[PDB]
Amino acid sequence: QSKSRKIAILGYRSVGKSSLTIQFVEGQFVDSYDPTIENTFTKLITVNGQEYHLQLVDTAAQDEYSIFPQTYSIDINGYILVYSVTSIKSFEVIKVIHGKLLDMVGKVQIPIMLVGNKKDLHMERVISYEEGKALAESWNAAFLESSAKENQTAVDVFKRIILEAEK
Ligand SMILES: Nc1nc2c(ncn2[C@@H]2O[C@H](COP(=O)(O)OP(=O)(O)OP(=O)(O)O)[C@@H](O)[C@H]2O)c(=O)[nH]1
Ligand SMILES: [Mg+2]
């Protein structure tokens, strides 16, 4: 009765894939990392009374040239696509990533959500809320903005991808 989830987090370099994950897992914010290394965390959380066993695959940076597999993994229960509100490139890239992710997964019922991270960097935003939101809507995906400095926003990200898979 203790549910299980493997979640993959995707996106361009330095968008905050690791920071969000670490903030959600260890409750702290970090200034540096090992960019091209894949990392996997385990985290237990109770969402609405139900206990979930979480595996979080913090993938290495990908761009428009990264190879996406042609076939999905059964054991992966959902995908978080991250970009930074401070980087146009990361936004262009997350669209390419969604594209290649959709080729890989086909019609299979595995949730994909979109996260615009670094919302706390007000003076460096180059992507509006409406643009991320409308992109997500065009994908029939969920959308949140987040800051890896703000624990509750990282919580809301993972909670939402879990809830999508229950839908
Ligand atoms: N202010 C602010 N800085 C952030 C936020 N998220 C990440 N950063 C910073 O952005 C830089 C990149 O963060 P990472 O978590 O390493 O990004 P990443 O997606 O894991 O990048 P790769 O591992 O290279 O793929 C780091 O210096 C972080 O401290 C955020 O939400 N707000
Ligand atoms: Mg990473």
Experimental method: X-ray
Helix axes 129-138, 88-105, angle to 10 degrees: 10
CA angle 156, 163, 49 (to 5 degrees): 85
Query: Beta strand pairing status for 78-84 and 3-11?
Result: parallel
- Cα distance between residue 129 and residue 132, in whole Å: 5
The residue whose CA has the least distance to atom 28 of ligand 1 is: 31
**Domains held by the chain: number:** 1
CB 35 near ligand 1, within 6 Å: yes
Phi, psi angles (nearest 5°) of residue 158: -70, -40
Q: Cβ(106)–Cβ(71) under 8 Å?
A: no
CB 148 near ligand 1, within 6 Å: yes
Cα 140 to averaged position of ligand 1 atoms, centre (Å) = 26
CB 84 near ligand 1, within 6 Å: no
Q: What atom of ligand 1 comes closest to residue 33's alpha carbon?
A: 16
The residues pairing with 115 across neighbouring beta strands, listed in sequence order, are 82, 144
Cα 94 to averaged position of ligand 2 atoms, centre (Å) = 14
Write the CATH number for 134.
3.40.50.300
Closest alpha carbon to 56 in 164, 166, 167, 154? 154
In Å, how far are 1, 28, 37, 58 from 147, measured between CA atoms? 32, 12, 22, 16
Q: Which spans in 8-147 are helix H?
A: 17-26, 88-105, 129-138
Q: Which ligand is nearest to the CA of 16?
A: 1
Instruction: Specify the resolution in Å.
Output: 2.4
Look up the domain containing 15 and give its range: 1-167
The residues pairing with 97 across neighbouring beta strands, listed in sequence order, are none
Burial (CB count within 10 angstroms: exposed 0-12, middle 13-18, buried 19+), residue 34:
exposed
